[PDB]
Amino acid sequence: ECYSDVSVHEEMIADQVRTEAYRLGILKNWAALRGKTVLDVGAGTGILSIFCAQAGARRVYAVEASAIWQQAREVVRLNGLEDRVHVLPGPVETVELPERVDAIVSEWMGYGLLHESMLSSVLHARTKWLKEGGLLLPASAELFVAPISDQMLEWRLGFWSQVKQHYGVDMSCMESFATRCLMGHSEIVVQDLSGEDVLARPQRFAQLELARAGLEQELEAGVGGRFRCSCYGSAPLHGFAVWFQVTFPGGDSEKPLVLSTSPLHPATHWKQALLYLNEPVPVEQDTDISGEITLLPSPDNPRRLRILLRYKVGDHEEKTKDFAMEDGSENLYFQ
Amino acid sequence: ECYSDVSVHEEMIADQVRTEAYRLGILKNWAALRGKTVLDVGAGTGILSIFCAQAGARRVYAVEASAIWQQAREVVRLNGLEDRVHVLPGPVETVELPERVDAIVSEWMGYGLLHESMLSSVLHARTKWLKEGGLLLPASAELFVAPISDQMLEWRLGFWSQVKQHYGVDMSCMESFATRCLMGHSEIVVQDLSGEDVLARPQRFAQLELARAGLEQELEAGVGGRFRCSCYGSAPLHGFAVWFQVTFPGGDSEKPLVLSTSPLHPATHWKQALLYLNEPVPVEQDTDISGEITLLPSPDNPRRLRILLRYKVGDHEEKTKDFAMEDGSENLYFQ
Ligand SMILES: [Ca+2]
Ligand SMILES: [Ca+2]
Numbered sequence: 001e002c003y004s005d006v007s008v009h010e011e012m013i014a015d016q017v018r019t020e021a022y023r024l025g026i027l028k029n030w031a032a033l034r035g036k037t038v039l040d041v042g043a044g045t046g047i048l049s050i051f052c053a054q055a056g057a058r059r060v061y062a063v064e065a066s067a068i069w070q071q072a073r074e075v076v077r078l079n080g081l082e083d084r085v086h087v088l089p090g091p092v093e094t095v096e097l098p099e100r101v102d103a104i105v106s107e108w109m110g111y112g113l114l115h116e117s118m119l120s121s122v123l124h125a126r127t128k129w130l131k132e133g134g135l136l137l138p139a140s141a142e143l144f145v146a147p148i149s150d151q152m153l154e155w156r157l158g159f160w161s162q163v164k165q166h167y168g169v170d171m172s173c174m175e176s177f178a179t180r181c182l183m184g185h186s187e188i189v190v191q192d193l194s195g196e197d198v199l200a201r202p203q204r205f206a207q208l209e210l211a212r213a214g215l216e217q218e219l220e221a222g223v224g225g226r227f228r229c230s231c232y233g234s235a236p237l238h239g240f241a242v243w244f245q246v247t248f249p250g251g252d253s254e255k256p257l258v259l260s261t262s263p264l265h266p267a268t269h270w271k272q273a274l275l276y277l278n279e280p281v282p283v284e285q286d287t288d289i290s291g292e293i294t295l296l297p298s299p300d301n302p303r304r305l306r307i308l309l310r311y312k313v314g315d316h317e318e319k320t321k322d323f324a325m326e327d328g329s330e331n332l333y334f335q
Numbered sequence: 336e337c338y339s340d341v342s343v344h345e346e347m348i349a350d351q352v353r354t355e356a357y358r359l360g361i362l363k364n365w366a367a368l369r370g371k372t373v374l375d376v377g378a379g380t381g382i383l384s385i386f387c388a389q390a391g392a393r394r395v396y397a398v399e400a401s402a403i404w405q406q407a408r409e410v411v412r413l414n415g416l417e418d419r420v421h422v423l424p425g426p427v428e429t430v431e432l433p434e435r436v437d438a439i440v441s442e443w444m445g446y447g448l449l450h451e452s453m454l455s456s457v458l459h460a461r462t463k464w465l466k467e468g469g470l471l472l473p474a475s476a477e478l479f480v481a482p483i484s485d486q487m488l489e490w491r492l493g494f495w496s497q498v499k500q501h502y503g504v505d506m507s508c509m510e511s512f513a514t515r516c517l518m519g520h521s522e523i524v525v526q527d528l529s530g531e532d533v534l535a536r537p538q539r540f541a542q543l544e545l546a547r548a549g550l551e552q553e554l555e556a557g558v559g560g561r562f563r564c565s566c567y568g569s570a571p572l573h574g575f576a577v578w579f580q581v582t583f584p585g586g587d588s589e590k591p592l593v594l595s596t597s598p599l600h601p602a603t604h605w606k607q608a609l610l611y612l613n614e615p616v617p618v619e620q621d622t623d624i625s626g627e628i629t630l631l632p633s634p635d636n637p638r639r640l641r642i643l644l645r646y647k648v649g650d651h652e653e654k655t656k657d658f659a660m661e662d663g664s665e666n667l668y669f670q
Contacts, residue, residue: 002516010494010513019502050504074508159345167354169385173409178345181337 003067005335015269021259025248026051032135033057036102041092041125042118046072049085060085063092092125103135111190112273113244114295115305115325116334123216138246140209145242145293146202149235183276188325192271193263200229224294231287236280242273287314338402340670344380350604356594360583361386367470368392371437376427376460377453381407384420395420398427427460438470446525447608448579449630450640450660451669458551473581475544480577480628481537484570518611523660527606528598535564559629566622571615577608622649
């Protein structure tokens with residue numbers, strides 16, 4: 001039977017930004033991996049564990065709790081690596097490896113970075129299995145926020161005011177209703193934007209070094225920060241977009257590899273996480289926007305992402321909106 | 336609160352094939368509508384009831400059971416037709432009109448024509464409210480089936496055999512798994528195709544004249560027919576596509592207007608209904624394919640579409656596959 005959704009896995013590998021960033025980021029670290037052992041947390045179809053072997057790792061432990069672990073084992077064997085790469089079913093928290101490892105690799109990032117991510121699992125595996133001084137791939141993550149005028153949203157809202165010119169029936173009254181429906185909710189919306197949509201310079205509001213003491217406690221407390229920016233020009237402000245990048249150490253190239261999900265960079269399967277205001281706000285060149293954004297666990301469920309937004313536009317009063325990912329949203333690691 | 340999904344309604348009106356076919360089909364029938372009364376079954380946002388008034392109807396009763404009926408009333412008033420077009424909430428089976436009507440107009444077609452359609456409601460309204468000899472817009476529907484080699488599916492299945500050439504990891508073992516996942520189910524798949532995908536001449540297998548005696552009983556019994564065709568050339572056969580057209584009488588133009596959902600015609604929001612075999616079947620030029628297809632009500636739920644397929648490819652034995660629309664599929668009239 002088909003428990004995993006094959007279409008999620010093909011979208012992962014069809015994401016050439018993601019796949020080549022990992023391939024090259026792993027290869028950059030040849031000197032550290034050469035003849036060493038690796039734990040791949042959440043190995044999926046196995047492609048990253050095989051990249052590690054191809055980068056010269058001696059042994060790779062590919063741990064995967066989903067149904068797809070079976071396919072990973074077949075992929076490993078098909079590439080003649082069954083000797084070197086061992087696929088282990090189940091959560092990393094209770095697997096037993098025969099040895100501690102020199103490195104951990106993982107595709108752990110969720111939508112919004114921290115929705116249904118495997119970061120907690122990576123941190124647990126680091127604590128339990130990673131040797132002193134060991135390597136983490138990627139090693140860090142950064143979080144960004146920017147105000148947006150979503151041109152696609154603008155088009156959908158204004159579309160009702162356009163019906164008269166195409167069919168001779170005025171439907172501009174439908175715009176209020178469309179606004180309430182499309183913006184008057186507190187759901188985090190996963191959608192891809194372009195640079196067209198970015199309304200002011202993006203602001204880094206958090207940085208996470210995976211090896212650093214205290215990170216798991218920070219995750220429970222909330223990952224966030226204040227921000228301030230000035231709008232590029234006149235537009236309807238629709239809200240904010242959140243995205244991330246992760247960085248692979250450069251190894252002997254001394255050039256880190258950055259995998260970005262910015263709308264100013266090539267699209268990826270993570271898209272961006274959109275936080276819409278209840279309705280559009282007109283802004284102008286040099287309109288000031290400040291606030292604070294915090295990524296939080298939900299109370300019911302720590303891997304359900306909550307985002308608490310405080311914002312102030314120009315002279316308006318500061319407002320707050322508390323967002324969360326919907327129950328029925330798209331899945332990556334927990335299908 | 337937002338009970339209706341505004342995005343379904345914008346997709347309807349953004350379907351320029353659908354919207355202009357109704358606009359023009361209604362206008363073709365000016366002589367029959369001039370000064371007459373109309374019942375619009377499932378009026379939605381109201382655009383079709385307003386088209387009817389613009390085509391010269393004296394009075395239009397716009398009946399709509401969904402939440403959107405409120406917006407339809409505002410649209411009517413905004414166009415200054417509140418005198419002539421009356422919006423009536425609730426199902427047509429229990430509305431009371433002050434008079435029988437000269438015509439019925441309705442956008443009743445569902446996915447696959449008969450998934451979650453309003454045809455039954457249109458037939459009930461005809462019986463109860465349409466005058467002797469009255470007009471139905473559209474007046475008839477035709478059902479088509481064709482064998483397909485879905486190039487998009489072909490690409491997704493073969494993608495795993497392509498990974499080696501892009502990333503140097505052989506993942507061709509994933510193709511079997513992908514096939515079982517994407518084809519080894521009995522779900523009707525709503526997806527848009529192009530003529531590229533059509534593997535033999537399409538075959539009309541049913542025709543429904545809405546005014547004809549016995550239609551509602553035929554719906555309960557199953558709407559279907561046998562078919563036979565010869566493949567255009569060498570391809571993997573993935574299954575069959577079902578689509579429909581409806582026809583508006585021509586009025587004094589003597590040229591009926593056909594609204595088609597064929598993949599050889601401009602795309603529409605109805606797309607096509609795809610019936611995949613459990614795995615691909617190679618065929619060649621002049622490979623014979625015959626069988627029978629029946630659109631049926633589901634036992635649990637008469638507006639849940641079931642499709643019973645019998646087929647024989649070339650010299651292979653005749654096979655059967657019993658499909659139905661998934662609980663979690665997309666909605667049009669019943670949101
Ligand atoms: Ca989920
Ligand atoms: Ca449904």
